[PDB]
Amino acid sequence: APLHIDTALPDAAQIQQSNSWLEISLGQFQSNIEQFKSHMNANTKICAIMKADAYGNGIRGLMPTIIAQGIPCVGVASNAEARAVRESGFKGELIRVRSASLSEMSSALDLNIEELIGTHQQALDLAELAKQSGKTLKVHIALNDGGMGRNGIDMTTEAGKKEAVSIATQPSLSVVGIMTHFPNYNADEVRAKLAQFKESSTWLMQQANLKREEITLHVANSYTALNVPEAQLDMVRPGGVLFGDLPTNPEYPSIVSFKTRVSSLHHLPKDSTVGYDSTFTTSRDSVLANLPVGYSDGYPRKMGNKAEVLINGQRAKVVGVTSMNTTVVDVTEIKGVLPGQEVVLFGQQQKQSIAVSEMENNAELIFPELYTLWGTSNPRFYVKSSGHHHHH
Amino acid sequence: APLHIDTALPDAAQIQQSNSWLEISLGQFQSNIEQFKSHMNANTKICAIMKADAYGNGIRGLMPTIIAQGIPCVGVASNAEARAVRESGFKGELIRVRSASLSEMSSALDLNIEELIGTHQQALDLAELAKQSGKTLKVHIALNDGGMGRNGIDMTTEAGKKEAVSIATQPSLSVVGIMTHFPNYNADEVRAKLAQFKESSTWLMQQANLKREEITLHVANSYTALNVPEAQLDMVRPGGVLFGDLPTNPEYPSIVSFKTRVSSLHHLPKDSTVGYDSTFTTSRDSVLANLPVGYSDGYPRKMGNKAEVLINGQRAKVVGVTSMNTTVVDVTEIKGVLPGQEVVLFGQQQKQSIAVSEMENNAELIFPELYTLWGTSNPRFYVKSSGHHHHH
Numbered sequence: 194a195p196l197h198i199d200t201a202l203p204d205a206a207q208i209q210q211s212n213s214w215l216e217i218s219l220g221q222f223q224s225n226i227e228q229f230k231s232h233m234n235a236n237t238k239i240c241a242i243m244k245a246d247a248y249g250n251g252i253r254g255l256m257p258t259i260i261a262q263g264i265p266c267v268g269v270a271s272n273a274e275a276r277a278v279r280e281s282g283f284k285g286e287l288i289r290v291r292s293a294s295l296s297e298m299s300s301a302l303d304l305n306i307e308e309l310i311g312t313h314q315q316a317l318d319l320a321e322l323a324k325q326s327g328k329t330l331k332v333h334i335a336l337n338d339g340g341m342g343r344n345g346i347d348m349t350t351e352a353g354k355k356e357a358v359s360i361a362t363q364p365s366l367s368v369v370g371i372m373t374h375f376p377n378y379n380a381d382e383v384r385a386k387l388a389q390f391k392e393s394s395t396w397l398m399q400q401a402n403l404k405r406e407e408i409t410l411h412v413a414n415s416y417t418a419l420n421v422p423e424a425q426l427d428m429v430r431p432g433g434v435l436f437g438d439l440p441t442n443p444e445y446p447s448i449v450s451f452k453t454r455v456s457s458l459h460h461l462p463k464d465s466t467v468g469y470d471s472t473f474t475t476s477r478d479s480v481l482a483n484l485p486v487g488y489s490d491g492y493p494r495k496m497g498n499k500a501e502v503l504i505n506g507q508r509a510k511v512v513g514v515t516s517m518n519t520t521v522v523d524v525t526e527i528k529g530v531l532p533g534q535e536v537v538l539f540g541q542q543q544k545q546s547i548a549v550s551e552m553e554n555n556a557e558l559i560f561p562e563l564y565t566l567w568g569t570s571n572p573r574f575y576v577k578s579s580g581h582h583h584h585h
Numbered sequence: 586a587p588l589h590i591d592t593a594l595p596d597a598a599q600i601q602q603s604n605s606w607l608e609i610s611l612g613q614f615q616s617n618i619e620q621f622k623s624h625m626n627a628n629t630k631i632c633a634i635m636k637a638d639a640y641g642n643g644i645r646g647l648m649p650t651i652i653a654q655g656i657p658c659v660g661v662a663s664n665a666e667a668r669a670v671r672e673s674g675f676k677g678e679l680i681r682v683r684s685a686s687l688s689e690m691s692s693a694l695d696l697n698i699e700e701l702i703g704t705h706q707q708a709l710d711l712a713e714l715a716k717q718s719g720k721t722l723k724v725h726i727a728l729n730d731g732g733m734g735r736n737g738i739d740m741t742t743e744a745g746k747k748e749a750v751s752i753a754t755q756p757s758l759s760v761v762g763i764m765t766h767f768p769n770y771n772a773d774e775v776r777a778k779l780a781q782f783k784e785s786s787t788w789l790m791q792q793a794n795l796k797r798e799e800i801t802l803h804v805a806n807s808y809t810a811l812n813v814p815e816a817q818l819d820m821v822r823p824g825g826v827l828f829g830d831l832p833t834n835p836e837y838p839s840i841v842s843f844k845t846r847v848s849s850l851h852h853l854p855k856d857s858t859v860g861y862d863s864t865f866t867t868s869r870d871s872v873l874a875n876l877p878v879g880y881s882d883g884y885p886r887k888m889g890n891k892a893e894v895l896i897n898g899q900r901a902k903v904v905g906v907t908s909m910n911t912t913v914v915d916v917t918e919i920k921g922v923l924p925g926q927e928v929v930l931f932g933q934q935q936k937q938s939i940a941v942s943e944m945e946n947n948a949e950l951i952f953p954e955l956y957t958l959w960g961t962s963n964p965r966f967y968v969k970s971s972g973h974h975h976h977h
């Protein structure tokens with residue numbers, strides 16, 4: 194992960210001289226949050242999950258919305274993300290959503306992170322950091338009832354139960370949450386595992402003399418929070434749906450668009466090869482648009498000869514394999530194309546749209562594999578537009 | 586591409602609290618440059634190609650070597666890269682290796698870039714920038730003899746020849762180079778296309794009254810420079826081989842390693858699922874190492890259930906699909922594993938090594954697709970080690 198998340202929001206001139214960039218719809222983000230909120234039970238609260246620099250969309254540009262919306266908790270993965278969240282002025286609960294090294298945890302003490310632990314050694318290490326800093330550190334215990342086999346303690350054996358109790362009774366730590374996480378979007382499996390989580394967490398709280406009313410039980414990602422409402426419990430952990438990436442729930446549109454512009458227009462006669470390995474050959478006299486985007490910007494090699502981009506409201510085929518920095522598009526039958534025109538690589542333009550399913554099939558990746566690396570490799574511009582006195 | 590390339594080189598403490606990072610062997614980079622140099626004809630010179638933030642390896646950390654080695658020319662793609670090169674103090678020739686938008690070219694005027702043009706409109710636009718800035722701008726003309734169908738002017742038709750002459754005779758520009766680029770590593774095809782390039786460039790120089798001895802003819806990437814030596818001409822453009830990524834020439838080892846550390850060690854009984862979609866189930870009581878690296882750091886989802894990582898000098902299988910931020914490894918039969926130990930995701934550790942071919946097969950990507958995004962998504966640490974008074 195990036196060591197530092199750049200502090201400045203790109204301005205319009207900076208975007209103008211960028212090769213490619215992300216346009217983030219702040220109004221769509223606001224709307225997705227409000228829509229999500231409308232489905233949450235009275236007794237739950239929201240922890241907005243902002244790992245991978247807010248799913249590529251950018252923590253620094255999005256935090257003012259999180260604050261305005263009064264969201265009480267934010268989740269992150271890296272220390273740089275935790276810093277960006279605190280630097281926005283956010284004074285709510287900040288949780289880490291993964292296991293983190295002792296070095297990570299120690300360097301983050303001033304950020305007031307609630308770490309996520311699933312092993313005795315993590316508890317011992319944090320207890321020592323607590324002792325050395327003259328305080329009690331707040332932690333969440335990850336349980337393995339969901340079957341992720343990832344950050345949690347499995348309690349299906351005597352040894353696992355014993356280890357869980359040791360975690361939960363560690364001197365110098367305050368257990369503020371107990372959680373699990375589900376591996377798929379199968380509502381019936383989630384319900385079965387939720388029941389087991391209730392049993393395990395109840396048992397653990399009894400053994401460790403924890404007080405139920407002081408513990409936040411949380412298990413739900415975006416899918417679960419909306420589609421298994423009885424799993425909302427004390428707190429939900431939506432990430433993807435806020436950003437409009439919950440495949441089961443298309444009523445939350447994606448907030449991200451990936452754009453570039455036409456740099457130059459080149460005339461190539463019939464029977465001309467394009468790109469490394471000469472995988473495409475023109476069948477007619479052609480006009481090709483040269484775009485200064487390639488796989489080092491996160492537009493994969495596999496897009497070549499498969500994907501279309503949008504130029505002047507029309508679909509144009511990407512021809513030849515993508516280069517490291519450049520993509521070539523066939524604009525022979527698109528009229529009105531000129532250098533400098535905006536190109537949509539993912540998103541909408543006039544009446545055309547590139548679907549997520551379209552991106553995934555062409556890239557042979559899942560959508561978050563694309564957008565998380567878009568976000569480390571391109572500047573973000575936060576577009577704010579609607580009608581009167583309204584966000585979207 | 587990133588809007589700004591971070592100015593500071595990560596220090597040791599910063600790396601210690603990073604989740605994952607790249608280790609760049611500066612001695613190997615130095616050695617690759619010196620070895621490459623030893624094969625260059627007396628009459629050629631080197632333009633080190635540093636696009637995509639030096640192929641993920643980092644312009645800022647590598648420029649002092651380029652300067653010490655007296656390399657006369659550097660190539661870049663983005664304005665941020667051009668800035669990072671000039672900010673190192675480099676006062677040699679700086680060329681752009683792709684078509685760039687008018688907005689990019691205009692904002693870069695103070696960087697003294699020699700742009701790469703293949704269309705009349707680019708020539709007209711640059712001539713106007715030259716006029717407005719009260720100078721003559723230096724340019725390279727890209728010709729399409731190599732058949733990339735990308736940044737160049739195709740001259741196989743009367744219209745293409747006429748356009749090439751218009752580019753080459755544009756008032757207020759100084760043509761300092763004429764170039765092409767080859768689409769594959771087929772030495773016989775390269776030789777045939779080289780002959781055609783000589784014919785085309787000779788013809789163009791005659792028509793535009795250019796003086797041969799004032800023009801740098803350049804056609805060779807890494808492969809071509811080493812394997813078709815008659816194509817070295819006046820200047821070569823090696824990128825990949827300097828960084829140790831020339832598949833045909835394994836005698837230039839890769840300079841990059843991708844690392845993380847063991848965050849936590851988890852006991853999971855037989856018949857336990859791991860990861861989203863539960864694609865792996867333990868067949869025995871297991872100990873799993875939780876690593877804080879995932880696909881948002883550039884370690885792809887496809888690595889899961891395929892790849893191995895190196896821990897304590899031993900290969901360990903990645904189990905379950907990679908998460909956005911976390912990877913799980915089976916260390917049941919690896920002794921000596923402890924939290925905090927270094928993990929090699931790509932590179933060497935003791936007597937073990939992960940091959941490039943291994944990475945490509947598992948990721949289903951070509952190597953530069955991996956490392957360019959590693960470099961936008963992780964800090965770089967420049968390791969300097971050898972024996973006495975020597976770089977490597």
Ligand SMILES: *Cc1c(COP(=O)(O)O)cnc(C)c1O
Pocket residue numbers: 242244290291374413414415416430431432433434
């Ligand atoms: C990322 C993640 C979330 C958010 O998941 P979505 O499916 O994007 O809503 C919540 N909790 C944990 C532990 C996660 O890793």
Ligand SMILES: *Cc1c(COP(=O)(O)O)cnc(C)c1O
Pocket residue numbers: 634636682683766805806807808822823824825826
């Ligand atoms: C990137 C590129 C190079 C360097 O290519 P390698 O195969 O990495 O040596 C040289 N010239 C141009 C025009 C390029 O695009």
Ligand SMILES: [Cl-]
Pocket residue numbers: 335341343344345373374
């Ligand atoms: Cl988990």
Ligand SMILES: [Cl-]
Pocket residue numbers: 727733735736737765766
């Ligand atoms: Cl080219």
